[PDB]
């Protein structure tokens, strides 16, 4: 069980860790989050009481080092940092626990939600989508734009998701125009799975990471990426049986977890109605279909 | 963006552009089988690909053989249209390739777009206009060459005959659409108006009668009258 200490909490902010969150008052003696489950990625995120604009946050993995949070009064935000002095860091952590100024990561033992949402997400891949190589953790906020979005400005602050585009040469083999556009199996299996992602786990992992960024930061290009990657699978006539079953599990937990009030912008009517009802794989998402109907029948 | 009444004069500028209409590509007769079930028989169709500025018409004849053993033919018809258009563009010298292709039906967009991926600078556009180009098979010479074809064939016409010698593209295009609109609403009457006078003939290299300027005005009047009347009959106005 690992810990992310906080130097202080100078400004009123709502702090999230994974799917949990706490209100912290200006100069409340908050000094960190303890009992974080080792073995998964995690995201700690922020929304200032005074600017409900720009939700922001840090993806990290405690196996990769000792991380802590510190407010920066110049840049105006809670920054994640790494403490390289292992002894100085256990000291800070032990004393804050002793004084009991830390919240416990509040996991119900029955609950596999976070595992299920992060099953295929790996820090090493996150750091390739969010390129900032001097840090071991990754910043994302509400307003970061994607490489694809940029093509249609600042590259240092971009989300380098894998570009998917159904009307590109990449997606369409010459001479198979009609075939490949109606049945995206060759784009999915040869171009994307075998060629770029190498395997289904890294594919699932980026999908999951994109969903999570759309949910936690309202990052709109992430939402576009999550939908694109679903649609490519659902629009392919030929998909390994192991991916289809896993996909139904993945989507299920994502739909389960989404705030109810947000279904309007985070869920793309067209993609979902096409995947669940028109696509080759309509009948392969039984759990995802059942939850979607009982929870957002309006969108459908 | 979409082509409409507002940006209508853009057809006649010096940017090369083509209309594509696919309404006569997949043509069938519907009939009863011996067992009383319904069945279709295809007949020869065509892609109607037209430069509105110059009148050049790239009539690509779709022989029934192209449907042999194929499913979802109405969907396939859109892709074959887009395949044949793309090949026409590839066959043309660079300086003849269009800058825009305007499809008369929005369902051609994705098929044409996918086939033209090699031509990213050719803009594929829909239109809000209701162009009568489906009536192209009411022009006797066009219908005859289509129905007689025994293999795939491209036939070239100038759809304005020699009009541009005397009128502008804008006026030539309005004449063509008025003629075809009339043929579309009431072919029998339209054709009657055009051939009533045996002394006005169609040149062998032409599609329409060699009317004088003054006779064109009477004709156009006769075609406008035809169109209005059919409108009252349709809607009881």
CATH number for the domain spanning A298: value is: 1.25.40.550
Q: Are residues A229 and A287 in the same domain?
A: yes
Rg (CA), chain A: 20
Q: What distances in angstroms separate CA A149 from CA A143, A172, A194, one per listed residue? A: 12, 21, 25
Contact state of A178 with B111 under an 8 Å Cβ cutoff = yes
Measured distance CA(A220)–CA(A225) in Å, rounded: 9
CATH class of the structural domain B164-237 = mainly alpha
The percent of chain B in helix, strand and coil, each rounded to the nearest 5, is: 45, 20, 35
Cβ atoms B158, B169 nearer than 8 A? no
3-state SS, residue B159 = coil
CA dihedral B139, B58, B21, B87 (to 10 degrees): 150
Domain end call among A97, A123, A143: A143
Contacts of A167 in chain B (CB under 8 A): 110, 113-114, 117
Q: What is the tally of structural domains in chain A? A: 2
Which residues on neighbouring strands pair with residue A48, listed in sequence order? A13
The closest of A139, A142, A126 to A219, measured between CA atoms, is A142
Domain end call among A117, A143, A169: A143
Which residues on neighbouring strands pair with residue B43, listed in sequence order? B27
Measured distance CA(B3)–CA(A121) in Å, rounded: 47
The closest of A243, A245, A216 to A232, measured between CA atoms, is A243
Helix axes A200-217, A241-257, angle to 10 degrees: 10
User: CATH 3.20.20.70: does it fit domain B9-163?
Assistant: no
Measured distance CA(A233)–CA(A266) in Å, rounded: 19
> How far, rounded to the nearest angstrom, does the alpha carbon of residue B200 sit from its chain's CA centroid?
24
Q: What distances in angstroms separate CA B68 from CA A256, B83, B167, one per listed residue? A: 49, 17, 45
CATH code assigned at A40: 2.60.34.20
Contact state of B113 with A177 under an 8 Å Cβ cutoff = no
Method used to determine the 3D structure: X-ray
In this structure, are strands B100-103 and B17-21 parallel, antiparallel, or unpaired? parallel
Vertex A200: Cα angle to A199 and A205 (nearest 5)? 110
Contact state of B114 with A168 under an 8 Å Cβ cutoff = no
Vertex A215: Cα angle to A212 and A221 (nearest 5)? 80
Q: Are residues A286 and A150 in the same domain?
A: yes
Measured distance CA(A155)–CA(A153) in Å, rounded: 6
**Helices assigned H by DSSP within B35-101:** 73-91
Q: Are residues A248 and A215 in the same domain?
A: yes
Q: Are residues A183 and A160 in the same domain?
A: yes
Contacts of A178 in chain B (CB under 8 A): 76, 79, 111, 114
Measured distance CA(B120)–CA(A154) in Å, rounded: 25
Instruction: Kindly state the tokens that stand for B187.
Output: 């072919």
**Torsions phi, psi of A57, nearest 5?**
180, 170
* Owning domain of residue A50: 1-143
Contact state of B114 with A172 under an 8 Å Cβ cutoff = yes
Give the length of chain B. Answer: 237
Cβ atoms A117, A210 nearer than 8 A? no
Q: Which residue has the tokens 């690909």?
A: B49
Q: Are residues A153 and A295 in the same domain?
A: yes
Q: State the span(s) of chain B assigned CATH 1.20.80.40.
A: 164-237
**Torsions phi, psi of A58, nearest 5?**
-130, 120
Domain end call among A143, A163, A196: A143
Q: Are residues A179 and A261 in the same domain?
A: yes
The closest of B143, B83, B72 to B113, measured between CA atoms, is B83
Instruction: Kindly state the tokens that stand for B14.
Output: 């010096």
Cβ atoms B67, B73 nearer than 8 A? yes
Taking the CB of residue B187, how many other CB atoms lie within 10 A of it? 13
Measured distance CA(B96)–CA(B113) in Å, rounded: 19
Q: What is the 3-state secondary structure (H, E, C) of chain A?
A: CEEEEECCCCCCEEEEECCEEEEECCCCCCCEEEEECCCCCEEEEEEECCCCCCCEEEEECHHHCCEEEEEECCCCEEEEEECCCHHHHHHHHHHHHHCCCCEECCCCCCCCHHHHHHCCCCHHHHHHHCCCCCCCCEEEECCCCEHHHHHCCCHHHCECCCCCCCCCCCCCCCCCHHHHHHCCHHHHHHHHHHHHHCCHHHHHHHHHHHHHHHHHHCCHHHHHHHHHHHHHHHCCCCCCHHHHHHHHHHHHHHHHHCCHHHHHHHCCHHHHHHHHHCCCCHHHCHHHHHHHHHHCCCCC
Q: State the span(s) of chain B assigned CATH 3.30.420.230.
A: 9-163
If you count residue pairs, one on A and one on B, with CB atoms under 8 Å apart, how many are there? 22
Contacts of B110 in chain A (CB under 8 A): 167, 181
Instruction: Kindly state the tokens that stand for A64.
Output: 């990769």
Which residues on neighbouring strands pair with residue B102, listed in sequence order? B19, B125
3-state SS, residue B44 = coil
Contact state of B117 with A168 under an 8 Å Cβ cutoff = yes
Helix axes A286-295, A241-257, angle to 10 degrees: 20
Cβ atoms A79, A68 nearer than 8 A? no
The closest of B149, B135, B191, B162 to B62, measured between CA atoms, is B149
Q: Which residue has the tokens 């594919």?
A: A203
**Helices assigned H by DSSP within B29-161:** 73-91, 109-115, 140-148
Which residues on neighbouring strands pair with residue B156, listed in sequence order? B58
Contact state of A177 with B79 under an 8 Å Cβ cutoff = yes
Q: Are residues A56 and A181 in the same domain?
A: no
Contacts of A168 in chain B (CB under 8 A): 117
Q: List residues of chain A with CB under 8 Å from any CB of chain B.
A: 167-169, 172, 174, 177-178, 181
Vertex A275: Cα angle to A217 and B75 (nearest 5)? 130
Q: Are residues A32 and A116 in the same domain?
A: yes
Cβ atoms B226, B186 nearer than 8 A? yes
In this structure, are strands B45-50 and A56-60 parallel, antiparallel, or unpaired? unpaired
Gaps in chain A (C–N > 2.5 Å) come after which residues?
152
Contacts of B82 in chain A (CB under 8 A): 177
Q: Are residues A117 and A173 in the same domain?
A: no
């Amino acid at each position: 069980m690992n810990t992310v200490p906080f130097t202080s909490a100078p400004i009123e902010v709502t702090i999230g860790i994974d799917q949990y969150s706490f209100n912290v008052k200006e100069n409340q003696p908050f000094h960190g989050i303890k009992d974080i489950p080792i073995g998964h990625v995690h995201v700690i995120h922020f929304q200032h009481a005074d600017n409900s604009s720009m939700r922001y946050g840090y993806w990290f993995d405690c196996r990769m080092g000792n991380f802590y949070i510190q407010y920066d009064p110049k840049d105006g935000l809670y920054k994640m940092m790494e403490e390289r002095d292992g002894a100085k860091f256990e000291n800070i952590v032990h004393n804050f626990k002793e004084r009991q100024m830390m919240v416990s990561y509040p996991k119900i033992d029955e609950d596999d939600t976070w595992y299920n949402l992060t099953e295929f997400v790996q820090m090493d891949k996150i750091r390739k989508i969010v390129r900032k190589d001097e840090n071991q953790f990754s910043y994302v906020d509400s307003s970061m734009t994607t490489v694809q979005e940029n093509e249609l400005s600042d590259p240092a602050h971009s989300l380098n998701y894998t570009v998917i585009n159904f009307k590109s040469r990449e997606a369409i083999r010459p001479g198979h125009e009609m075939e490949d556009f109606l049945d995206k199996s060759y784009y999915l299996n040869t171009v994307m799975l075998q060629g770029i992602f190498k395997n289904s786990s890294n594919y699932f992992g980026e999908l999951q990471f994109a969903f999570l960024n759309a949910m936690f930061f309202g990052n709109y290009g992430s939402s576009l990426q999550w939908h694109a990657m679903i649609e490519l699978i659902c629009s392919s006539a030929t998909v390994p049986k192991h991916m289809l079953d896993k996909l139904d599990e993945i989507l299920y937990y994502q739909i389960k977890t989404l705030p109810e009030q947000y279904s309007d912008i985070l869920l793309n009517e067209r993609v979902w109605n096409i995947c669940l009802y028109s696509s080759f794989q309509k009948n392969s998402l039984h759990n995802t279909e059942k939850i979607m109907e009982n929870k957002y029948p309006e969108l459908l | 963006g979409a082509m409409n009444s507002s940006n209508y004069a853009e057809l006649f500028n010096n940017d090369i552009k083509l209309f594509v209409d696919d309404t006569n590509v997949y043509r069938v007769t519907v009939h009863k089988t011996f067992e009383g079930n319904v069945a279709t028989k295809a007949i020869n169709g065509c892609i109607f690909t037209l430069n509105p500025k110059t009148g050049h018409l790239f009539l690509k004849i779709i022989h029934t053989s192209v449907w042999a053993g194929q499913k979802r033919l109405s969907q396939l018809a859109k892709w074959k249209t887009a395949e044949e258009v793309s090949a026409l563009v590839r066959s043309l010298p660079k300086e003849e390739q269009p800058k825009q292709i305007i499809v008369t039906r929005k369902a051609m967009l994705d098929p044409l777009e996918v086939h033209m991926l090699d031509f990213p600078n050719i803009a594929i556009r829909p239109t809000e206009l209701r162009l009568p180009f489906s009536a192209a098979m009411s022009i006797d010479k066009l219908s005859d060459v289509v129905m007689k074809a025994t293999e795939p064939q491209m036939v070239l016409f100038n759809i304005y005959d020699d009009w541009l010698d005397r009128i502008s593209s804008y006026t030539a295009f309005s004449r063509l659409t008025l003629l075809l609109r009339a043929l579309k609403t009431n072919e029998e009457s339209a054709k009657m108006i055009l051939l009533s006078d045996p002394t006005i003939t169609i040149k062998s290299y032409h599609l329409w009668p060699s009317f004088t300027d003054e006779q064109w005005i009477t004709i156009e009047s006769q075609m406008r009258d035809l169109i209005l009347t059919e409108y009252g009959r349709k809607y009881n106005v």
